[PDB]
Ligand binder design. Sequence first.
Ligand SMILES: CCCCCCCCCCCCCCC(=O)OC(COC(=O)CCCCCCCCCCCC(C)C)COC(=O)CCCCCCCCCCCC(C)C
Ligand SMILES: CCCCCCCCCCCCCCC(=O)OC[C@H](COP(=O)(O)OCCN)OC(=O)CCCCCCCCCCCCCC
Ligand SMILES: CCCCCCCCCCCCCCCC(=O)OC[C@H](COP(=O)(O)OCCN)OC(=O)CCCCCCCCCCCCC
Ligand code: HEC
Ligand SMILES: CCCCCCCc1cc(O)c2ccccc2[n+]1[O-]
Lengths: 449, 25, 54, 175, 54, 397, 37
Amino acid sequence: EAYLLPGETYTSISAKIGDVPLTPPLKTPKGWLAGFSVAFFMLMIFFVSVTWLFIRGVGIWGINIPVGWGMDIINFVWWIGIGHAGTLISAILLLLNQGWRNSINRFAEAMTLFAVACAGLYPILHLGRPWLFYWLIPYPNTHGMWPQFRSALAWDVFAISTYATVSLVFWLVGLIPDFATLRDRAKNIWVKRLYGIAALGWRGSARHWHRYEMASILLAGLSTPLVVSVHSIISLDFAISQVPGWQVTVFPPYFVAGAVFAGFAMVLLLMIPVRTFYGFENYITLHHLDVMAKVMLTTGMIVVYGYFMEVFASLYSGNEFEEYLLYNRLFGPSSWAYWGLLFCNAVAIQPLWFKKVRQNIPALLIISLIVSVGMWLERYVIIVISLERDFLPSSWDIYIPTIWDWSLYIGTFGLFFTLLFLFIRVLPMINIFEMRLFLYQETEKAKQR
Amino acid sequence: LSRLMIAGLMVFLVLSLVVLLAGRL
Amino acid sequence: AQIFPRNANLLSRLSIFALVLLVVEGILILGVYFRSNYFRQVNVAIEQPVAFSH
Amino acid sequence: VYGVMAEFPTPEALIEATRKAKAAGYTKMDAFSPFPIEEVIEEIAHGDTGVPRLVLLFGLIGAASGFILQYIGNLVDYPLNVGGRPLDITNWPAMIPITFESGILLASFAAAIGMIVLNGLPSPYHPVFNVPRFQYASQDAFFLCIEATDPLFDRSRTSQFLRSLNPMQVSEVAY
Amino acid sequence: NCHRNPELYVRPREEVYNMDYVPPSNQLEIGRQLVAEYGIMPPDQLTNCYVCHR
Amino acid sequence: IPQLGQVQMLGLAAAVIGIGVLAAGYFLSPTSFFESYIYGYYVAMTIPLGCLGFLMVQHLTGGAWGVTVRRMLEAGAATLPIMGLLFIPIALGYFDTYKALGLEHPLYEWANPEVVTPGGAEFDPIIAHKVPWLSPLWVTARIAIFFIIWSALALTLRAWSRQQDAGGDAKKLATRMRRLSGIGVALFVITVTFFSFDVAMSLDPHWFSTIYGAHYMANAGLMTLAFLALMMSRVRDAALFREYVSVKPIHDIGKLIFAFTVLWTYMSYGQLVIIWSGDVAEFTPWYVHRTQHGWVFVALALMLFAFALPFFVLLFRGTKRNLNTLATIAGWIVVMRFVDMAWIILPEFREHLWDIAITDVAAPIGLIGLVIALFAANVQQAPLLPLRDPNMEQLQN
Amino acid sequence: MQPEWSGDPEVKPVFLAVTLTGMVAFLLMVWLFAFYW
Ligand SMILES: CCCCCCCCCCCCCCC(=O)OC(COC(=O)CCCCCCCCCCCC(C)C)COC(=O)CCCCCCCCCCCC(C)C
Ligand SMILES: CCCCCCCCCCCCCCC(=O)OC[C@H](COP(=O)(O)OCCN)OC(=O)CCCCCCCCCCCCCC
Ligand SMILES: CCCCCCCCCCCCCCCC(=O)OC[C@H](COP(=O)(O)OCCN)OC(=O)CCCCCCCCCCCCC
Ligand code: HEC
Ligand SMILES: CCCCCCCc1cc(O)c2ccccc2[n+]1[O-]
């Protein structure tokens, strides 16, 4: 297939992308209105859950003395791992010179920013004394105190702050000539200045385009090891511990693979309604869905290899705690998570080898939803089951989540979808430039035969 | 214009010294 | 030139400068308030029910 | 007064006009397009951008500051025994992540702010927007402006040369 | 500050209730002498958390 | 063809020298002959396994660098049956025929009946716990199955490429090797990880690591990428790369080398920080053995010359756009990979930095000379680039 | 290539203004966080 369907011009690309924003608010579609109403209702659920958490304590959740990390940390790793694929499309595909990033990178990087926004509250939300998140930051105080910096949560402070900041910076840099296009295409004189001050007078200059391309290349070549280091550090906040399910040394590439897996699951699950509800079949194509499912299949195979590595470590070790970790995962009180994980991450990916299933849209939607559920189950298996049964059998208990961490999860879903619907209202879903540049590159390829 | 930067820096410095003196008030 | 006036470049540069200075001034105001003698009750004659004279 | 620019319908005509203007000896010229033509930059903006030197400098500054902050804070300013871990350069693991993240942060700040400053982007009001057809310069229109800082510049002769390049429209752009 | 550098603030133990006592011109040599004389612990011991907090 | 013959006779001479010095050292220490041969095999397997791995990666993700180095990757990966034939000394080392070959106690710790059987002299219970998995019969069967998989995969990919060059549809005989590469990347990852396990980590069964094997994959990838840079610099005047190959495959190869130098130090540092921060005595003796008796100097040299020097000289655009500078950096990199596999494997035998013999440098140099000669003989049988390929348009840039 | 503002007489005044602002803010933060008490 092709990554750009024939019959497109630069002005047609500019009109077809920038006419979904810049419409008057009275002409807002009812589908957007219904989705934003659902997102705002779940954001009200988020506000109620956060207010009751701050009023009562972190004891409204199911966390206890052996399992001190529960659904809060599961949803933290889940939401922070959603953003890896958007950072991959924005940076690693720019490094690799892959032409399919040009129509998915804006929405995917916006999804990365909103997933990091949802996952950055989770440390502050689970913290137990939430107003002292700044004591983890190295800041000057009258005590002379410092963060330890040997723990992985200080690395998490630096990694999450750097990931959010550099992702927002690279997204705004990728938006600046789109801001120029919206400033040019606007009609009302007062919404010209809304995108004019964000475009900063871009002008499309070829001298400016050289520095822009160099800055985008260097930002991609800094954001690839940035995102690998961020997900390695989020692996390390279990892997530096002595917990038998957590002292596993393949966790940094395993967590990188799991984050890219869940990220492209969410990316496909949000491209497909955007592709079928906006006129983006020429831009987001069946080849785009095919290659995104191919990267899903590859990274899910790496996660299956990580499962095999953990099972091999448990069987190969003579260690009773590794043996009981495998036994507890297979036949424990929380073995439902491991068995559903095996079904949702191993059985459901063997259809993705097949070309017809890879090209099929509802099969891709079902597979992406199953992979998201199974990745939540993976983070449950990593955290909760390993914390449930530990070295001393007297300190064994079961983790039962309450209604309040589920309500907080539904609320962060609503916050993510509220931010996404605001993004698709006021900003283009796909990059106006670099897709007309993609059209020019495909025209040059056709001229070169 | 660098002169407006210098004037804004002077205003910021004067206001910050007033803030420090009010801290030691 | 189509939308923004002539002084928009100087206004935008001065806006970036004033935003950075405002962030620095806010951090400074927070630090001075948390170290101030009023907040820490330093060098203030705390009144007693008898006004005992050391 | 600022310069003379000409409008072109296709990037191939923009490439040909930028090649013909550079062959006539015109320097200090800029071309405006909705996307990087490249076949114009290699001619009118060839050289070092100045971004990667700043990126390398502030990445080194960030890595050095991220190591020095952890070293001073955990080892010099406040020597604390946590977990039996070393109190010297043997504690070089668990300094690499914050060192690397600080280096990445300041290098990406260098990339962004250095590009924005170095291309002179912080100039929303530009003389080039005085042309009423420059609104389409991000909506499939292509321009090539020969600035007044060129030595062999004349308001009539440059306009005649650009008209001899067979354009769509020549506009004498003002300040 | 005084738990890490007590020699700038230590005094003969017999000049503690004397409000007229001022430290001498040098004070560092006699501060080290009084720290060694009274067996004042190193800053690691004096900067331990459970010295103060509990 | 002249430069291919020059590197072929260079590898033949290096192989003759290495095998001669190794056979001279065998008569003075037949144990250390096989202990150095294990390290030489681990070094010399970094090239053909990495060639098969990037052959499948470039088949899945096409590129100008991929069609530039594709026939070199086929020639490197076609040497894997000869590597299967060369694994036989290690297998005879850990079989029951160790007594007839001068080696006094068997080559691996799980080949000892006194260790893996109860009532023996040593009877290590952890190694006796791994007695079915870490047995000579099971290990030989697993590594032979891995050789069969690698040989069938590489021979099928090379045969399909040669059929595409000779006669047939170029588009139809590209989807077949793309699908074979798609299943072969997963098979290659699990197969190379378990091969690296059973060859290197099975020396000391007291210590296990799950990022091992994939760290060996990054090591082998960096080794064969610098190998590709050196060979690409050697064949730059061959009347096939003068017309169709420009500086953009060189730039892509240098970017891949820089990226996998960063990836190798990532897979080393992740394991190091996990074992260092989680102070468990099941894992810390590895870094104790890799730090004590002068091995901390080799670890610091790996920090300084395998990461800090190529990271800084490969960060510049001009040093990877030039084949001479890329070849010099690639030679320094393959020297540092020799040092890295030394630091990984040789603490399991020598125990001291000053206990390194001349067999420990004779075995990898001679066996990589054999790899050089076999690769040159295989690339002399084919054109250097797939002219009748759909991805030939990527070379036009 | 040369930067955009190359040859402008305001470039070194604005660089001295930015560096003066940075050093004044740095010294003021150092005073507040180290020599204030
Ligand atoms: C255990 C710790 C490991 C340390 C990891 C260090 C990796 C950091 C690399 C950053 C990417 C910059 C490449 C720029 C670029 O795009 O290069 C261009 C050529 O253009 C240029 O001229 C270069 C532009 C400026 C470069 C200066 C960089 C500043 C210094 C970085 C600050 C870090 C600190 C620590 C000094 C073309 O080259 C490429 O595009 C190649 C990109 C390769 C990506 C590497 C992917 C590896 C992923 C693994 C990550 C490992 C974990 C541990 C981080
Ligand atoms: C995901 C976390 C790790 C990311 C590391 C990836 C490496 C990023 C930086 C390396 C850049 C490589 C140079 C650029 C390049 O050659 O790639 C683009 C290439 C060619 O594209 P054309 O220009 O020819 O045009 C084609 C479309 N018009 O496209 C490719 O073929 C991609 C190359 C594949 C990269 C293989 C990396 C795999 C990483 C494996 C990590 C090991 C895992 C161990 C468990
Ligand atoms: C010893 C050597 C190392 C071998 C490493 C093997 C293990 C690594 C996995 C292999 C990665 C290959 C990705 C293949 C996915 C794919 O098929 O996509 C192909 C795309 C585009 O291809 P198109 O358009 O359809 O056709 C081109 C041919 N005409 O190419 C790409 O570049 C996308 C690949 C992006 C890589 C992301 C996956 C990285 C895994 C993450 C985990 C890593 C842990 C650190
Ligand atoms: C210098 C004027 C000091 C200040 C300010 C504070 N402390 Fe102190 N402290 C000081 C000395 C000379 C010593 C003697 C201990 C020794 O071994 O010489 C101490 C010790 C204490 C202790 C005793 C605990 C122990 O010695 O194990 C306590 C509980 C203690 N200091 C508390 C304390 C607190 C809470 C302070 C802040 C208000 C404080 N000290 C300030 C000298 C000085
Ligand atoms: C200002 C940025 C700070 C926000 C991130 C805080 C870091 C942080 C703090 C915690 O207490 C954690 C506990 C479990 C898992 C991750 C954690 N992270 O990442």
